[PDB]
Design an enzyme around this catalytic site. Structure first.
Site, PDB file in Angstrom:
ATOM      1  N   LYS A 141      -7.594   4.184   6.938  1.00  0.00           N
ATOM      2  CA  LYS A 141      -5.991   4.585   6.173  1.00  0.00           C
ATOM      3  C   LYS A 141      -7.304   5.883   6.152  1.00  0.00           C
ATOM      4  CE  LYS A 141      -3.474   1.850   3.940  1.00  0.00           C
ATOM      5  NZ  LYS A 141      -3.341   0.593   2.580  1.00  0.00           N
ATOM      6  N   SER A 144       1.225  -1.133   0.052  1.00  0.00           N
ATOM      7  CA  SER A 144       0.402  -0.388   0.190  1.00  0.00           C
ATOM      8  C   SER A 144       0.773   1.416   0.341  1.00  0.00           C
ATOM      9  CB  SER A 144      -0.577   0.006   1.145  1.00  0.00           C
ATOM     10  OG  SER A 144      -0.185  -0.499   1.849  1.00  0.00           O
TER      11      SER A 144
END
Ligand SMILES: *[B]([O])([O])[C]([C][C][C]C1=[C][C]=[C][C]=[C]1)[N]C(=O)[C]([C][C][C])[N]C(=O)C1=[C]N=[C][C]=N1
Length: 196
Positions: free
Chosen positions: A136, A93
């Protein structure tokens, strides 16, 4: 509530997610010397260290195609560090966040301020989905981000978030990296009165 309030060139903001919620991690790049190389620090894992070598291969290739005059990445001895110092980090990520840090350094122009992103990258630039988009996204909001870039496949995970969380986020759902570039570095794609 974040490490950088103003990202210079070579510094991009990424998003990392742990089982304790979200957090904002900053990718950083610099020069070691005045064939070109790459270095990595920040207690990165065997899986992410591949994302660095992929983003590095792609950023060099992206330079070869769009601005071929730029040799910065093919010659320079570059160093990438992801603070904070001793925290362990593993996962793709961070892919796109790295590409942008490499280009930002190789151009000498900073990224859009108040911008965080997360997304796995392929070698051709396809932007693949990542996990814990809820945490996130939340850590970007609790940390003061106004522009978030998510993998387009992660659209549901973002719209599972309550009304107050997502409101006021300029969110872009991207499938190739070229869509991240046109958002991270807007001035590149901006009409101008060509003079003379
Ligand atoms: B990503 O979700 O893979 C993320 C990348 C972290 C590294 C980074 C992030 C942003 C900018 C620069 C670098 N990986 C993780 O968040 C890791 C641990 C990071 C400290 N967590 C996991 O991979 C994971 C796996 N299963 C459950 C929960 N977390």
């Amino acid at each position: 509530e974040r490490m950088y309030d103003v990202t210079p060139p070579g510094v991009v903001m990424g998003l990392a997610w742990t089982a304790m919620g979200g957090s904002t991690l900053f990718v950083e790049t610099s020069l070691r010397r005045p064939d070109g190389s790459l270095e990595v620090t920040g207690q990165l894992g065997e899986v992410m260290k591949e994302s660095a070598r992929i983003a590095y291969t792609f950023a060099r290739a992206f330079l070869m195609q769009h601005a071929p005059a730029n040799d910065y990445l093919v010659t320079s001895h570059i160093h990438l560090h992801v603070p904070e110092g001793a925290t362990p980090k593993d996962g793709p990520s961070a892919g796109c966040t790295i590409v942008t840090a490499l280009l930002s350094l190789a151009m000498g122009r900073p990224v859009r301020q108040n911008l965080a992103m997360t997304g796995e990258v392929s070698l051709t630039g396809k932007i693949l989905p990542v996990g814990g988009i809820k945490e996130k996204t939340i850590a970007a909001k609790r940390a003061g981000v106004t522009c978030i870039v998510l993998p387009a496949e992660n659209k549901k995970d973002f719209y599972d978030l309550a009304a107050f969380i997502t409101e006021g986020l300029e969110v872009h759902f991207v499938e190739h990296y070229r869509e991240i570039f046109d958002i991270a570095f807007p001035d590149e794609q901006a009409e101008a009165l060509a003079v003379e």
